[model samples]
Every structure is written in C-alpha cells, then in structure tokens.
Target chain A: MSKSALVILAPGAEEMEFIIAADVLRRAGIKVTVAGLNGGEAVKCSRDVQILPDTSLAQVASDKFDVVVLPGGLGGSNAMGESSLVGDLLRSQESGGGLIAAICAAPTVLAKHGVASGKSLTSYPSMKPQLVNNYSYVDDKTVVKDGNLITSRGPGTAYEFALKIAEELAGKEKVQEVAKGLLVAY
Target chain B: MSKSALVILAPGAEEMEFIIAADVLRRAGIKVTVAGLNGGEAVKCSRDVQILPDTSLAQVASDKFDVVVLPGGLGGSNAMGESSLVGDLLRSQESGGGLIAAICAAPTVLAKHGVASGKSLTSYPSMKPQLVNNYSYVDDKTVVKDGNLITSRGPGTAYEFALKIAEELAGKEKVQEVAKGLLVAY
Candidate 1:
C-alpha cells in the first residue's frame, strides 16, 4: 500500500482547512491519517469543533508518512509550536522524508522551525508580518506551493487548498475528479 | 427589560462569526436568544464546531425580539432559505418592528425574502450577486447598515459586524468598550 499522509491535530485547528484537505485527499484515493498532538480522543478546534485523530503524535512513526499537514488556528499554531512532538515531525518532513504543508496562521509553525525563512509563503493577512522572512502577500490567491511546502490563506481558500494538496499527493487528474465529485471547479 | 434579539442558528455557521457576535452583544448587556433551525441541543458549524442554542425556532415569538441576527455559513444560508421557521422569523424582523442583520452568506436569506432588493448591501464574495441590490464588495468591511437591515462580509469582518450591532442595539460607547476588549479598532 502507498504511504498515507499524516495530519497533526491540535487545539484551535482551523476545522474547514483540515476537513477540506482531508476530504479532498480521500476523494482522490489518497489515504490520510489524522494524528493528534497528544494521545486519546479527538482535539477541539478553534470554535469547539471536535476532530478525531487516527493516532497520537507519540505513536505516529514520522518515516511511515508521505507528508505532514497542519491547519492554522489561534490555539493550533500555539500548541503545535510549543509541542516538541510536532516540532520533530515537522523537522523530519523538512528533511525531504515527506512533504510539509500548512494553511492560514498555521504556516507560522513552519516559520517557527525556520523552514519558511527564505521561502515564499502565504497566510492569513493579519499573520503575514509575523513571518521571519521576505513574506510575499498574495491577496485572494487560494493556495501557494513552494517546493515541498504548501500554504493557503483562510477558510475562503479552503477548497483550493484541499484541491492543491490532492494534486500534490495524487495527481491533477485525480484532483479534478474529486473536484467534480464535490461540484467544485479547480 | 428591553426586548431580546433573535439569533438564527444553522448548520455550518462560522465559528468566529457566531461566537464573536454573541459575545459582543452579551457584553453590551443585550439579551441574545438563539433560535436554532435544528433543535435546542447544538448546531454543528462547517468547521465541525458545535454551538448550543438558547431556544428553538418553535419557541421564538417574533414579537418578543427587538432584532434578528444571522451568522454566515453555506448551511446557515440553506436553512434560512429552506426552513419555514427561519424564513418566517426573517420576515417578522423585516416588518420594521425589529432590526435585521446577517453576515456573509446569511444575508442571502434576506435576499431570498426580497428585503435586500434595491438596498446597498455587502456579503461573502460568492453571495454578492444574490443580494439583488447595489452591492459593494468590501473584502473585510465589518458591517453595512442599510435602513433597519445590516450585513457583513465574513470572518474577517466579524469584529466590525459585532461592533456595529452593539452600537445599534446598545450604544456607541458600549460598542467601543467591547472593541477595545477584543483589541479591535475602528
């Protein structure tokens, strides 16, 4: 079987961004494993959305995954940034073992790990200045892909973000199929 | 006591849009009564967030509410248009006995009632055409007040929506206080 992508779940995760990506990936026949920051039940999102993880960060073997996805939210960024477990997973993905992707405020986590310092990235407009590098703000752009890292704005770009990730993980043809299934255009 | 405001609850309600408006209104010493199209238990948002409502559509007495507030979401918009209870409540609010407001796609509900026709309004980019009026595409404008009806864009404009509603219901001073507390200016 092909390696599955792992999504890191933490408090304040942007629910739309996470669900859209996961749904799109699944529709494209890409296996996705949601890994919670800690073990046990699902984590609560920014506004009380509960998301169940397939495994805990403690149990996820970084090498087994093909990519690590992070969804941005206020608490999500803070929690993922503070947890050494998340940091380690991101580091492994950064080394080319897998892809690293984040959206909205979540991309700040990449900047925290110095992965986005000199790379072009996009995030919620309000969060751009906090970035460590020459951040290029792409207004109204759905998704931005630079190398192995992918970033998007916020809820408005959720569909595009999911489609982009699906394209990266599977292929354009598969993504187009999923988009058709969802009645959304690329 | 002054009459309470009616808040419509629907599936896929934006977390920030719902909570921020409720919080700001409550802090302004306003009674926000949530009327859920679902049930009184909890309504799930698009991001998977579940919000508990104070009452159900069956329990709302249109005459008792001084204002009606609708939080934006695709699901919410569907409920506003498809559900008889929601449609009735919107009509009652439009009778000039109370204020009517909606954020993002929620305003489409008003558009469905023909209340948005010929009015200068704003809403989620995708929902602009539905307003059937002189619409302005304010990417992040907080609140657009046209007569007794008010509308906002989306999450990015949530702060402004809350503040404007507070100002209308409570007072400018009270709205200012809430804005300061939330670190939102303008």
Candidate 2:
C-alpha cells in the first residue's frame, strides 16, 4: 500500500464530512480506517446517522498514521478539541512528516491542539474564530493546505475537500479518474 | 411536519447512493428512514460500510411512503429484484401516485417488478439492459424523471439525482438553498 490514513469518528461526527473522505480514500486504493474516538466501533453522528467504525481510537497508535483526518460537527469537534489524547497526538504528529487535516468545525480541533502553527486553514465560517490564533483563515479557498496540514469548510465543500486530500496522497492522475465519476451535472 | 421517505436498504446496498440522498434530504428537513430489508437493524453494505437501519421494512405499513427510494449495488439490487414484497410495493406506489426512485443498478429492480413502464430511464452503463424493454433509455440526462418514476445513472449522479427528488418533494427554493452550500470549487 502506498499509504494508510485514519479518520477519528467522535460521537456526533458529521457523517458527510467524514464518510465522503473515507469512501473517496478507499476508491483511491488507500487503506483508510474510521476509528471511533470514544472507544466503541459504532458512532452515532450529529444528524442521527449511525456509522460502524472500522476500529476504536483507543486501539490505534500514533505511529500508524500517514494521514490523520478530522470531520466536523459542533458536538463531535468539541469532543476532539477537548481530548487531551488528541492534543497529545497532534503535538507529536508535528515532529514527523505525516499529514494532519481537518474540515468544518474540526479545524478548530487542530487549532485547540495547537498544531495549526500559522498554516492557512478554512472551516465553517461561524467556526473559524476557533480555528486560528496564528493561522491562515483563507476566505477564497475551499480546501487550504500549508506544509503537511489541510483544512476546508462544511458539508457542501466535503466532496471537493476529500478529492484534494486524495490528490495529495494518491496523485493527480488517480484523483482525476475518481473525480470524473462524481461530476453528475444533470 | 415534513415529507417522509423510505430508502429500503438490502444487504449490499450502495451506501454512497442512499446515504447522500438521506443526508441531503435531512438537510432540507425531510424525514428519512433507511429501513433494512428482510428484518435487521444492522446492514453490511456492498462496499463494507456498515449502517444501522432506522427501522425494518417489515415493520412499516405501505401508507408510510411519500417517496420509495432505492440505491443500487449488484447484490442488493438482485435481492430486491427477486422479492415479491418489493414488487407489490412498487405496483401500489404507481397506482397511489407516490414516487418510485432508483439509482445505479436498482432501476432493474423497478423493471423486474413491472413498474418501469415505457418511461425514459437510465442505470449504470453496463446495467442498462435491465431497465428497459419498452422504454426510452435516455443516455444524455444525468437524471430522468417520468411522472412519479425517477431514475439516474450511477454514483457520479447521486447528488443531482437526490436533489431532483428533493425538489419534487421539498420544492425548488429549498433545494436551491441547499445546493448553494455545496458548490465549493477547488
């Protein structure tokens, strides 16, 4: 496998934000693990959608991630934002080369954990204040990337956001091939 | 009170197709139930995405549907295709003027049950053979609607396909408002 990625699914995680990313990563032939952050294999999402995660966050070790992605809902983002474990993981990730990404309100989780480090970031407009202290809260870009960190806004930007992460991990040619099927204009 | 929808999820239903529709519809305030077919709360999707059903199809009465939606995966479609239960539901849906919708490989489920009667239709390119006998297999439209029947191509067209149904049940203005948030380019 070229790489492996982990998506931490907190209770109340945004299903669209997380699932779209995991599914697209799978399509790109990347090994993606959806880990339940509260230590269970099943996660009940913010909008009442139920997801059965592939693993539990408690069972994962930080050395396992080539990419660590976060999906946002206020409740779920807050869970990650407050987790000392997540904060610890983010601080450790910064010393290595693996990518760390977040979208919607989850970007605030990165900022709370202090790994944003002045990188350009984007999030649901209302949630941006929490995503920066010394960060690039770019208004023009849907998915913003600086160094090994990536960020984007809410649900509508989900597909585009996933494709960009896939582009970074899987290469442009493969990402384009996958994007071709989703441009249903009718 | 808002409109109610039932997306019958069989053992191997395509998660992307059904979930996107359900999530998008919920965003528009529609009540959606992803009912598992053949009785069970947990469903193992074709792509290995596990979902907890809101209810079982057997527990619901026919009067519950404002729209009966189907998402196609080869195994899931075949299961529904061969079911007399689904066949009976489709016939009554047509007679009662409730909407009947299917995507990817599931339109064949409509055809097998004698519900796809000469309406313009479409399916996954290789799956088109099952969607017609005496119908116009319109190749150009991303989504095709004929009276109460709606059919779409594949995963690529799922969002547009769902939005078309949303417009029918929820109205154009609401769908447009929802669409505005998803247009995050790059």
Candidate 3:
C-alpha cells in the first residue's frame, strides 16, 4: 500500500514551499492531497500566485494521513495558527502516531496550536525566535526530525523537507530514487 | 526604475519551476506577469497543481518585458514548441535584446522554435540530445547563460535560473538581496 500525505494550503501560502512539497511527495509515490483552508477556492500565495487545491479541509477532516505538511508565509501561517480545524488536525495526527511536517514560518504554527511542543525543529531563520521557547530549536541543519515530527527552514530547504517526509513514509531508497529523477541531491 | 518579467504558463507546466521563478523574481522587485497560454483560465500543471494565471498570453503579446521565462515539463515544453505564438514571442524578445530564460525541458522549445539557435545552454539531462545539435549544450553547470538567453536544468536548478535572470535585469546586488530573503544562495 502507498503512503498518503496531506499538504494544507491557506490564503497567502508560500507558493514555492507548498508546490515543491506536494510535487516531490507525489514523485516519491505518496498519494498527496493538497487540501485548501478556503473550501476549494483558489488561494492566493505570498507572492500573489493563485493555486487551486485538490480539495477542502472540511471535505477530509476525518481522514487519516501518513503525514500532514504546512508551508508558511506570514499570512498563511497566521491563518493556520488561528484555525480550530487545523489545530484539531495537528493534534489528531500527533496522537495517532502519524508524521507532522512544517517549513519556514510554519513550525511556529505547531507551537501556536500546541502540537509538537518540545520536539527539536528548525524553521525560517526569523521564525527561530518564536520556536526556541517552546521547542528545541536546531539551527545548523536544513531539515530536523524528532520522532514523528519533521521541520525545515525556508524555500531553500523545501526539497530536503519534502524528501525527509518521503523517507519517513516510504523509505530512504524510495526518496533517493525520487530525488534522482528531479536531478536534486538527496 | 523597476525591471519587468513575463512568465508564460502552459498546460502541464511544472508548478515548482513556474512558482519559484515568479516568486523569486517578485522578491527581487521585478514586475512579474504570469500569462496563461489558455487565455486566463486555470492551468493544470505536471503534478496536477492548478494555477490561475494573471492574464492571457494574447493580452500581453504586444507588451515589452525585460525578460521572458518558460517553465518546463514534457507536456508544456511540447506545447510551447508547437505554438507559433510562442515562437514569435521568443523571436521578438531576442531581437529586442531582452533576456529569455527556460528551465527543465523548455530549452528544447527554443530549439524547436528556432530561437537562440547557437547560444550556450543547458536543459534537463534528457533534453541534451535535442539541444546539442542546435545549441552549445553544457552538462556540468546548473544554469547556463549566453548573451540574452539563459537556460537551466530541472526543478532543482530553478532558483539559480530565476536569480540569474534577476541579476541580468535588476543587477547582481538586487539578486543577492532577493536570494538572502529567500534563504537561498545565489
């Protein structure tokens, strides 16, 4: 059976982070669902690129996934932090022993939602100030994983972030194969 | 004065390449326009990420830009190769001394359309055969530039490709500033 990943997109999401994670995971043969926070409407990203999601959060709230990914832009991360639905999703994913991943400003979302507290993580450089208090913040690594939670820096580390999630859900070999196809070093 | 960029989005375009280029260019303060081949409709990318373009190609066909970008996937590259409109646009861009950039399979579109026929370039490894016959093909470099034309490998090289274009239009200082903000090394 194949692994399934959920990438949540909200208004003002970081387009590169969201798209790269979804694309790389799909390439790794994980069934990726790009779920929108805005009920199937096209979400405008941080740079104003508009992306239409695969489905809405309301449509798949009860479903299970191998991992849940959060891509961050200030507006998108703030929205995710404020949403009760996203909070519930993260808590359920954590309690179920599923992987939870976030990048850029989003690791702060995990802290804001009270999930992954005390887990070692890394996020976009500026976001470090926000996470160090609640989580064991790692600065040197591009991607950091603590048990079921994975975190990474900004868009520059998106491939590393996505490939790490693929490695956890699929395997190291599977992720290496997928990375090779994209001509990216894993 | 601000520089301008026009990114042409076709059906099955690689979402990562398309989004990263636009986002990075915008970060460099370049005025970026995402023009759809499908006349302002949502374009379904290679990984099935749907993006609503800012305008139709025809709407901006007569407009001048500092750079024109082509994001590549097999389907999108083939479509660009087959479109006489794309051929005209590339030709006009070259004649006006405007920079033209392509990534992944798109460098082959330049060959098919007879634009930048003798420039040094690079493309997805699989596209080497098609480009080597008409252009100077480089394999070791992630991004290759010749005069007004720039070409790069796959999604993994998109940031380098976009940053190079920003350097040409906006200046190296501007590109360095943008790369720093994105957490990417230029």
Candidate 4:
C-alpha cells in the first residue's frame, strides 16, 4: 500500500506552508488527506485565502496515518494548541512511533500536547521563546528531525520539511524523482 | 495608495504557486485581487486543491494593476492560452508598462498571447522548447526579469518568483522585511 499522511488545516493556517507540504508529498506518491480542523470543509487561511479541505478532523480522528502535519500561522497554531482532539491525535501518533511534523508556530503544539517531549526540534524564530524550555531547540537548520518528530522554521523551509517526510515514508530514491519533477534541489 | 496586483487563477492552477505568490505579496503589503478566470469564485486547482477567488476576472478586467501574476500548471496555462480575456489583460498590462509575471508553464501563455515577445525570461525546463524561439530564455536563475516581465521555474522557485515580484512592487526595504518574516533567504 502507498504511504499515507494527514495534514491538519485550521483556520488562519499559513496557506503557503499548508499547500506546499501537501503538494510536495503528493508529488512523491504519498496519499495526503487534508483534514479541516474546523467542523466544516472550508478553511480561511492566514492571508485571507479560502481553501476547501478534503474532509474534517472529526471524520478522521480515529484513522492511522504515517505522519500528521501541522502548518502554522499564529491563529492556526493557537487553535491547534487549544484543541483536545489535536492533542489526542498527536499523543496517539507519538505513542505509535508515527512521524509528527510541525512548521513555524505549530511546533509549540507539540509542547502543548506533550508529544516528543525533550526531543531536539525547531520552530519559527519568534516561537522559540514558547518552546525553549521544553524541547532541545535548534536554530540553524531549516528542517530538524529527532526520532519521529519533524519540525521546520517557516514557509521558506516548508518544501524541505515535506520532502523530509516523503523521504521518511517513501525513501530517498522516490523523493529524488519527485524533487526533480518539482524542480526542487532537494 | 498601496500597490495593487491582480492574480489570475484558472482551473487546474498549481495551488502552491498560486497561494505562495499571493501570500508573499500580501505580506509585503501589496493589495492583491485574486480573480477567477472561469467566471466564478471557486477555482479547482491542480492536485485537487480548491480555492475561492476574491472576484471573477470580468469584474477586474479593465482595471489597472501594478502587476499581473499567472501561476502555471499545464492545464491552467492551456486555459489561459485559450482565453481572449487573459490575452487582453496581458496585452494591456504590457502596453501600460506594468509588471507581468509567469511561472512554470504559464510563460507559454505569453508566447500564445503575443505578450512580451522577445523579452528575456525563464520557465519550467520542459517549457523551454515552446518559449526558446520566442523569448530570451535563461536557464540558470530561479527567477528572471527583463523590462517588466518576470518568469520562474515550477513550484520550487515560486517563493523566489513571488519575492521578485514583491521587490518590484514594494521595493527592497519592504521586501526584505517581508522576506525575513516568512523566513525566506531573499
């Protein structure tokens, strides 16, 4: 079977990060399910872009995925941090050794949910303050992975973050083919 | 007044390029209007991502813009190539000395529309054959500009392509601030 991923799209999510990661993953032949954090299918992204997600979180809460991705804008991250359902998913993913990836401000959601505790990770520069004490934060790399926890800085690193996830699920050869097609130097 | 841009979103548009350019430009404080080319608010992007455009192309067809952006997927570019309305907008934008940006296969729309004839630009590698005989095609850069025309490769170069447009519309200082916030190295 093909590898599967679940990307959580919340209101005020950074559209670039959300879209790029999903696009790149699908390019690598992974089955990506974009689940809306809100109860409905439409999501209002950070830059006022409206996206129609494939499904809602409630419908897929019990499903297993190889990875769960969180794309961050401040509001989206805050909403994810406040969701007990998200907390449950992350905790379950961590316990099952599935990859948990977050970009920009979303890394703090890992801290909030107590997943990957004490793992070395990184987040958007401004969000470092919130995660400094809980995780081993790395500042220099665009994408950081510790065990099954993957994190990246922000929109600029989203391609790398997604490709890394693809590499984990699909391996280097498939990722190379996918990256070349997208013209990504990865 | 703030700089204004019109992004033409056609069916089967590459969602990453469509969203990244608009998101980056908005971050630079430019007023962007995403106009749906299919005469409706809903655009079904390539890879099945659905976007709700801010307005239909006809509503903003005669308006002047600082720049007009075209995001490319093979199908979207083909749609743009077949549209006389897109042709009119590009021709007007070129004659008015406003910026015209195309990425990936969308640069072929310029060739099809007879806009920016003989201009220096670049595009997705596979598109080079169609544009090489008509324009000055450069292969080395992620983004290219000649006069008012800006072009780029596929999804991987979308950020650079958008930042270049932001730099043209908002100037280097504002673009620098905006790039920093997005964690973009430009």
Candidate 5:
C-alpha cells in the first residue's frame, strides 16, 4: 500500500499551508487525506478561504496513518491543540514512531504534547516562547527534521516544508521531480 | 466603497495562485469576491482541493469590479478562456480600462480575448508561444505590470504576484503591511 498521511483541517487554518502541502504530497503519490476538524463540514480558513474537506477528523483511521500533519494559523493552531482528537493523535503518533509533522504555529502544539524535547524544531517566529526544551529552534532552515518529528517555519516557507515531508514519504528524487512540475526551486 | 476584486474560480484552477492572491488581497483590505464558474457551488481545484465560492459567475456585477483576476493551471486556464461569459467579460474590461490580472497560463486567456496586445506581461514559461502579440513578454520579473494589466509567472511566484495586485488596489504601504503580517519580507 502507498504511504498514507492525514492533514487536520482546523477552522481558521492557513489555506496556503495545507493546500500547498496536500497538493505536493498528493502529487508524490501519497494518500493525503484532508481531514476537517468540525465534523466533515467546510471550515473557513484563516484569511477567509473556505475549504470543504475529504472526511471528518472524527472518522479518520489514525492507526493507518504514516504521517499526521498540522497546518498553522494563530487561531487554527490553538484549535488543534485544544481538540482532544488531534492532541490524542499526536501523542499516539509520537510514541508509536510514525512521523509527526507540524508547520508554522502548529509546532507549538507538538511542544505542548511533550514530543519536541531534545529535538531540532522550527515554527513561526512569534511562537518561540512556548517551546521550552532541549530542542534547537533553528530559524534559518525552512524545515527541521529530528528523528520522526518534523517542524517547519511559517507560510513563506510552506512549499519547501511540504517538499521535505514528500521527500520522507516518497524519495529525494521523487520530490525534486515534483518540485520541477510546480516550478519551485529545489 | 472598498476596492474590489473578482477572482473567477473554474474547475482545475491552480489553488496556490488564487488562494495566495485572494488571501493576501483580503488581508490588505480589498473586497475579494470568489466567484465560481459554471455554477454557484464548490469546485475542485487543480490540486483537487475543494473550495466553496461566494457566488456564481453569472451573478457577479462585472461593472462594479475594479479588478478581475485569473489564476493558472493548464486545464483551468483553458476553461476560463473558453467560457463565453469570461470571454465577453474580459473583452468589456479591456475596452473599459479596468485592471486585468492573470498569472501563469492565464495571460494567454487575455490573448484570446484580444487584450494582451502591446502590453508587457508574463506567464508560465512554457506558455509563451501561444501569446503572440505586440505585448512585451517579460520572462525575468517575478511580477510584471504594464498599463492596467498585471501578469506573473508560476506557483513559486504567487505571493509576489498577489502583493503586486494588492499594491495596486490598496497602495504600497498597505501591501507591505499585509506582507508584514504574513511574515513575508516585502
């Protein structure tokens, strides 16, 4: 079976972050599911872009996931952290050794769940204070991958962030090929 | 009245081009109306992301529009170009001297509608041959604007493209402020 991924779509999420990541990942042949947080209904994203998701976050098969992704906007990140469904998914994905990825403000969600300690991580610049740990919060690199955990900076770095996740699911060669189609510099 | 923009959403449109443009424009205080083509309903984008639009193309008040924007993906661009409503709308906008902006493959749509002649514009590199005209095809600039027309390259250049449109509608200071909030260096 192809590697499977779950993208949790919280209300007020940054539309570019999830759409870019999902598009790139899907192009890479991963089974990328856009899971809506509020019971399969459409959610208005940050900046007012409304998106209808593939499935409700409630009905997803978390155990079958190879990766769980979180897209970040201030409100969306807070909503993801507070959702028992996502908080539990992150915890289980963390200890179970599957890849746990979050971008922008969502990395702080990982920090809250105690999974980012002793790892190199990245997040939106304003989110530095909540992440108290041995994690090296590298700002220069767009994406930071330590063990099975991956963290990425904010939206400006989104395509590169998605490419890194695609690289892990597919391969470096596959991701470079995908980047060419999207006209993104690799 | 708020400076207004009409983003025509067709099936198979590039999600990044329009989403980044719409999101950034809305953040810059432009009244962006996301109008779906074919009907007033949700449409799957080029990347298969389902987005619900505010209204249908048939219902838009084209005369009140300060700017009419088009995103690009090969299939999406074709759909926009072939629509009688879009063809007529673009022709009217051209003669009326309103702003007409398109990115990637979308500029060729203007060529079809007879508005791109003698204008300096840009599009996805592969799309150049179709746009034969007195129009100066600018391949180097990330965003190219001449007269009331604005054009940009592919997905990688989407944010700068949107910022250019926002700058036109809201002024440079407003565009920079919006960029600052998005954590982008403008």
Candidate 6:
C-alpha cells in the first residue's frame, strides 16, 4: 500500500506552519511530499526566507496521495489558488478520495475553492474576516478537525495541526506514539 | 549604535527555528546576518528540505555582531562543529565582547566551545547529556539566560528566544512591542 501525502507549498508560505504539519505526518510514518505550486526550485516565505520544495505540483500524482495539506502564507495561498492544478487536486481530495487540510491563511484557498463555504474552520485571527458565510469559527485553538478538513490557527497551532493530521492519516495510536516521542500530549 | 546579530544556518538547520528567530528579531528592528557553514547556495534540513542563508561563514566578521545565534538541527550542529571558522567565532563571542545564544541541539555547539561551562542552559531534551557538567539544565523552558549566553529548548522556544534576544539588544520596550504584536506575553 502506498502511504503518501501531498503538502502543497507556495511562495510566501508560513515556514513554521508548513514544516510542523509535514514533520508530524512523517513522524507518524507517513510519506509527506512537499510539492511546490509553481515550477520552481525555491518558494519564498514571508520576508526573504526561501524553502525548496521536494517536487513541483506538476510532478505530483493526486491519485497517489492519501491527503493534500495546504499551509498558510499570503504568497503560498495565492500561488496555490492561482494554480488550476492545485484547485483540482483539492477538489479530488474533497470528494472523499483523500484528506484535505489547511492551516491559517491557506484555508482561504479552501474557501475560494468553495470547500469551506459552510464548513467550520479557523485561521490566524486577523484573517477571520475573510472566512465569509455563517461558518463556525473556533478561536485560539491549535487545531480543528472537521471531517477530513483540518485547520489550524498559526505558529502556535503548528504542533496541534501536525498531530491532528497524523491522527487522521495514521490513526490515534500512531499519533500517540509520535506525540510521546516529541514529548507532547493532546 | 546599530545592533547586529549573527545567525548560523548550518546543514540540517531547522528552517522554522531559524526563520522564526530571524523574523522576530527583524520585526524588533535589529539587523540579522545569516551565515551558513556548509558550502552551497542552500543547506538541506532533515528529509531534503533546503534553506538558503544570507551569507557564508567565511564571509562573516565576528567583531561586527553583538550576538551570535545558532539554530539547531542534527546536521546543523555537526556542520558547525566541523568548521574552524565557526569555532573561532564562538570563541570570540565567548570572550564577553558579545552575547552567544543557541537553540535546541545548536546549544551543544556552545557547550563544545566551553561557553556553556558552569552556565545554566537548556536544549532539546535529547541533547541534555551532552550539556552536562558545569551546566544547569532546564527541561521545558522557552528561554534561559545564563549571563551573556542564552539558550532555548526547541522550535517551541523560537518566539521566546527571539524576544529575549531582542530585549537584550533592542531594550525591553522594543521587545514588549513585538511580543504584544504577536500576542505573546512574558
């Protein structure tokens, strides 16, 4: 069985939010493919921090992934939103083919794709105004899991977001193991 | 006076730890120079994640910094340990002309340089043994200040480490303003 997940990274992605989610999945024994939205060797985060993706969105096989996780960043979300490929991949995952998760501003992309219109979600507090609709918002929580759609707040939510993703993909037992190894409990 | 800092980005440097610290410091109005010990335009973290530094270690002037901060990673610490330039920089920083700080396993580099001797410090729990003897270890603190040496445990400590560094270099008011903006409390 292929145990792989896709983590879509774009320019201006929040480095902490993206890496924590990826780290959590990997610790849970899942293969996380950090894919870039644009065909590029590096994706610049907020400020000038550049992160190299493991593969480009063009190279990722949506059907092969167990999940597609999006990390929040102004540039990252814009890049992913601008990519029809990313939207289609997210749509596929939302149709029960796999898991779809977003944290912080990246959830806006989910909203833009019409996946989060009526679904409850959370993001950086300042971005809450963009959520639109009568969606329920959980404030100050690290992670929120609504079916296969997991969302988190911000840097403080990185650890919880990662663990929740692990639990969804690997199960509670694996989450416990990974959390124990990291000396975290939840 | 211009307050300057040196941030080491050795191979395997945890991208979040390095970026978060640099981000916080920059937000607090300090000049940060990223120096990589490993050769290349970028350094790879665990699992092939690559990040680029602003400058190479060979090009940094130790005397120009008010503090030298090391970001932790298994390979990051190893690369620093193998660099004579890094060793010299640490020795210079230890002589009381400037402050020295390290986060996670990067603190082990300071310990190896004798700067951690008889100082209270903290690092990732896995690195506790290496910091033994003449060092007081704290298990899970955000940041620890040992005279001119500052240390933090892991990624979770990034915010606190950055704030503490900012307080030391930019004054308490500036640190407080940055912390308030981030909704963090001391």
How much lDDT does each candidate structure score?
0.72, 0.81, 0.92, 0.92, 0.86, 0.78
lDDT by residue (tens digit), candidate 2, B103-162: 988988877787857888888877766555667797777788988889887777877888
Report the error of model 6 at residue A3, Å.
3.0
Ranking by lDDT: 4, 3, 5, 2, 6, 1
User: Which portions of model 3 miss their true places by more than 4 Å?
Assistant: none
Ordered from best to worst DockQ, the candidate numbers read: 3, 4, 5, 2, 6, 1
Docking verdict class for candidate 2: acceptable
| DockQ of each candidate relative to the true complex | 0.06, 0.48, 0.91, 0.88, 0.74, 0.48
Better candidate by lDDT, 3 or 6 = 3
lDDT of 4 by residue, B19-132 (tens): 998999999999999999988678998888899999999999879999999999999999999999999999999889899999999999999999988989998998889988
Q: Give the per-residue lDDT digits (tens) of candidate 3, residues A1-186.
A: 889999999998999999999999998889999999969999999999999999999899999999999998889999999999999999999999999999999988998998988889999998888998888999899999999989999988998899888888889898888988888898
What TM-score would each prediction reach against the true structure?
Answer: 0.55, 0.92, 0.99, 0.98, 0.95, 0.91
TM-score of chain B of 6: 0.92
Please provide, for model 1 over B56-166, each residue's C-alpha lDDT reduced to its tens digit, 9 standing for 90 to 100. Answer: 878775355777889887887877787777777667677755788888788788767656456667877787666655444454445688788788877556667777888
Model 5 per-residue lDDT tens digits across residues A13-68: 99988888888899888998899987799999998889999999889854558899
lDDT-wise, the better of 2 and 3 is: 3
Per-model interface RMSD values are 8.2, 2.5, 0.6, 0.8, 1.2, 2.4
Error of 4 at B157 (Å): 1.3
By summed lDDT, the worst window of 10 consecutive residues in model 3 chain B runs over: B126-135
Is 2 or 4 the stronger prediction by lDDT?
4
Which regions in candidate 2 have their CA more than 4 angstroms from the true location?
Answer: A181-186, B181-186
Off by over 4 Å in 6: B180-185
Number of the predicted model whose DockQ against the real structure is largest? 3
Which regions of candidate 1 fall more than 4 Å away from where they truly are?
A1-7, A14-36, A39-67, A111-144, A152-163, A170-186, B1-7, B11-36, B40-84, B96-186
Once fitted onto the true fold, the runs of candidate 4 whose alpha carbons sit more than 4 angstroms away are none
